Chains A and B, each alone.
With several copies, the nearest count.
Chain A
Amino acid sequence: VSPTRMNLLQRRGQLRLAQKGVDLLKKKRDALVAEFFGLVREAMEARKALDQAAKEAYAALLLAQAFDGPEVVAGAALGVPPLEGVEAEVENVWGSKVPRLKATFPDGALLSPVGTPAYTLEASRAFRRYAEALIRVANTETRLKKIGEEIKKTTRRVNALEQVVIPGIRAQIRFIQQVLEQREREDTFRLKRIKGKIEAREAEEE
């Protein structure tokens, strides 16, 4: 870079802007961390609900397979549609979209809901509730992971700035200051030389 007073002022302004940006990014990171903790609490609640639903649904399945034959249970499960093509809505959060899972779940009067087995329908309802809890848990966890990614990105930006950008700008500032001071010192030396010449020519030769 060219060492000039204007360039030195520009570098000082760049340093001030970098410091202000570091502070701004730290504030943004604090807000992101608060949001992250809120989502962690909600994720803990959702995980506990999911575990309770898993317990009740597994108990219902075991009861159905004990009271009713496993083979007829498998046959009843065969007649259930795969219910594929679940909606994946993209939700904007903190500057980008993330997929949110909201199953329409158009079973309604699900095909072959009752028949030779009786307890199988109760286990099916329990497993549908379990699937709802699972999609809730996944919807929470994807947002939590995205928030963590944003926090990591902000931390990386802050570290990069305050470890390579600010020191480099400060080094450039000190180098430009040294060059300017050397130039003014040379100018002072030249002025002393010319003053000596003037006094020599004015005194010795009258």
Chain B
Amino acid sequence: NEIAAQIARQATVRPDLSGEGEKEEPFAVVFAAMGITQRELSYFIQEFERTGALSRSVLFLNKADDPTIERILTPRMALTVAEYLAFEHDYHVLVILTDMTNYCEALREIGAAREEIPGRRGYPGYMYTDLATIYERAGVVEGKKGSVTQIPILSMPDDDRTHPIPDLTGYITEGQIQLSRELHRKGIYPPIDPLPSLSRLMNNGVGKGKTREDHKQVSDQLYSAYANGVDIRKLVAIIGEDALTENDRRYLQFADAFERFFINQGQQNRSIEESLQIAWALLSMLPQGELKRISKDHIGKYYGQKLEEIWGAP
């Protein structure tokens, strides 16, 4: 919920980076919450009120003690509002669904109420079709300046990726952002784990004319370096840091600094330029020439930044 509220009150478009320079893109956030408690309802209300993000957002709050049919209808109404705004007023709309697990459970309960034989794991056999009808009501249309973006937050029932809900969601959606419990219990917020996270449409959305030109290579280098760092972090427990080479020690330092500064950004509203600057500062710890995923031009014109430009820790 904290990450969802932060995204809702921080998400924006960057027409200046796109090269258009139009600055005429209206942005709206449709926030649909299914089966949330009074605590979460109050938290969302306060978060939207205190920062002024309410004036640009439409909220569909549904409580856990409300009728389940209202839980079923909440995403439908939210997506109807989003589609109307985007395709009749050229709004760039970001749709946030607080918990699709609650929606799936309500769908299962109602399907049991209609005397319908459940499919796999007791869930309705048409769960895939219903989830598709919800998710596919988003995208961009030829001849329309608006857009609809969906970030459906869902909690795995037992931290299991083979459960029907996350499996069907992965079938229908393009990638996923996987929160990490280990990062959360280590004090890192937001506890987003880069290794299992994936954006399948990321490549077509970055590159020269969007964000900055070094975006893709920087992301690849960060991913590879972090994976190597966590591997060496596991290995140093058995073999020790004295048996490590210089590269292994540098990768350990990079992993530590990465977890401390990049992931653990707290409540800061970092711009994409600031994020790229922090990424380059982190990569500067690694020796030049180990960045095999980055071309020599970007290395020449970006490497060497000292990390203390951003404190990172909140």
Given A24-B234, A28-B238, A163-B237, residue A185 in contact with residue B118 (CB < 8 A):
yes
Q: Which residues of A contact B (CB under 8 A)?
A: 2, 4-6, 9, 12, 20, 23-24, 27-28, 31, 35, 152, 155-156, 159-160, 163-164, 178, 181-186, 188-195, 197-198
At the interface, yes or no: B88 with Cβ under 8 Å from chain A?
A: no
Q: How far is the CB of A156 from chain B (nearest CB, A)?
A: 6
Smallest CB-CB separation from B159: which chain A residue? Answer: A9
> Are the CB atoms of A159 and B115 closer together than 8 Å?
no
Interface footprint category on B: 10 to 19
Given A2-B160, A182-B121, residue A156 in contact with residue B115 (CB < 8 A):
no
Bound form: Cα–Cα A164–B243 in Å? 21
Smallest CB-CB separation from B244: which chain A residue? Answer: A31
Bound form: Cα–Cα A24–B231 in Å? 8
Smallest CB-CB separation from A161: which chain B residue? Answer: B238
Bound form: Cα–Cα A31–B243 in Å? 8
Cβ contact of B162, chosen from A2, A152, A155, cutoff 8 A:
A2
Chain A residues within an 8 Å CB radius of B239: 28, 31, 156, 159
> Are the CB atoms of A2 and B161 closer together than 8 Å?
yes
> Are the CB atoms of B115 and A178 closer together than 8 Å?
no
> Are the CB atoms of B117 and A156 closer together than 8 Å?
no
Chain A residues within an 8 Å CB radius of B238: 24, 28, 156, 159-160, 163-164
In the complex, the 5 A-B pairs of residues with the closest C-beta atoms, listed nearest first: A159-B238, A2-B162, A27-B235, A160-B238, A2-B160
> Are the CB atoms of B117 and A192 closer together than 8 Å?
yes
Q: How far is the CB of B124 from chain A (nearest CB, A)?
A: 12
Q: What mask results when residues 152 to 178 of chain B are scored 1 for a CB within 8 Å of chain A, else 0? A: 000000101111000000000000000
> Are the CB atoms of B237 and A159 closer together than 8 Å?
yes
Chain B residues within an 8 Å CB radius of A31: 235, 239, 243
At the interface, yes or no: B289 with Cβ under 8 Å from chain A?
A: no
Smallest CB-CB separation from A5: which chain B residue? Answer: B158
Chain A residues within an 8 Å CB radius of B160: 2, 9, 12
Given A4-B162, A156-B238, residue A190 in contact with residue B118 (CB < 8 A):
yes
Chain A residues within an 8 Å CB radius of B15: none
Chain A residues within an 8 Å CB radius of B231: 23, 27
Q: How far is the CB of A155 from chain B (nearest CB, A)?
A: 7
Cβ contact of A28, chosen from B115, B162, B235, cutoff 8 A:
B235
At the interface, yes or no: B200 with Cβ under 8 Å from chain A?
A: no
Chain A residues within an 8 Å CB radius of B163: 2
Bound form: Cα–Cα A188–B115 in Å? 12
Q: How far is the CB of B182 from chain A (nearest CB, A)?
A: 13
Chain B residues within an 8 Å CB radius of A189: 117-118
> Are the CB atoms of B235 and A188 closer together than 8 Å?
no
Further contacts, 19 of them, CB under 8 A, given A24-B234, A24-B235: A2-B162, A9-B160, A28-B238, A31-B235, A31-B239, A159-B239, A163-B234, A164-B238, A182-B121, A185-B118, A185-B122, A186-B118, A189-B117, A190-B118, A192-B117, A194-B115, A195-B115, A195-B117, A197-B115
Q: How far is the CB of A167 from chain B (nearest CB, A)?
A: 12
Q: How far is the CB of B115 from chain A (nearest CB, A)?
A: 6
At the interface, yes or no: B300 with Cβ under 8 Å from chain A?
A: no
> Are the CB atoms of A188 and B117 closer together than 8 Å?
yes
Chain B residues within an 8 Å CB radius of A159: 237-239
Q: How far is the CB of A22 from chain B (nearest CB, A)?
A: 12
At the interface, yes or no: B52 with Cβ under 8 Å from chain A?
A: no
Q: How far is the CB of B268 from chain A (nearest CB, A)?
A: 33
> Are the CB atoms of B237 and A191 closer together than 8 Å?
no
Q: How far is the CB of A31 from chain B (nearest CB, A)?
A: 6
Q: What mask results when residues 216 to 250 of chain B are scored 1 for a CB within 8 Å of chain A, else 0? A: 00000000000000010011011110010000000
Chain B residues within an 8 Å CB radius of A9: 158, 160
Cβ contact of B122, chosen from A155, A160, A164, A184, cutoff 8 A:
A184
At the interface, yes or no: B120 with Cβ under 8 Å from chain A?
A: yes
Chain B residues within an 8 Å CB radius of A4: 162
Chain B residues within an 8 Å CB radius of A2: 160-163
Given A28-B235, A184-B121, A185-B122, residue A155 in contact with residue B240 (CB < 8 A):
yes
Chain B residues within an 8 Å CB radius of A197: 115
Cβ contact of B121, chosen from A12, A20, A163, A178, cutoff 8 A:
A178
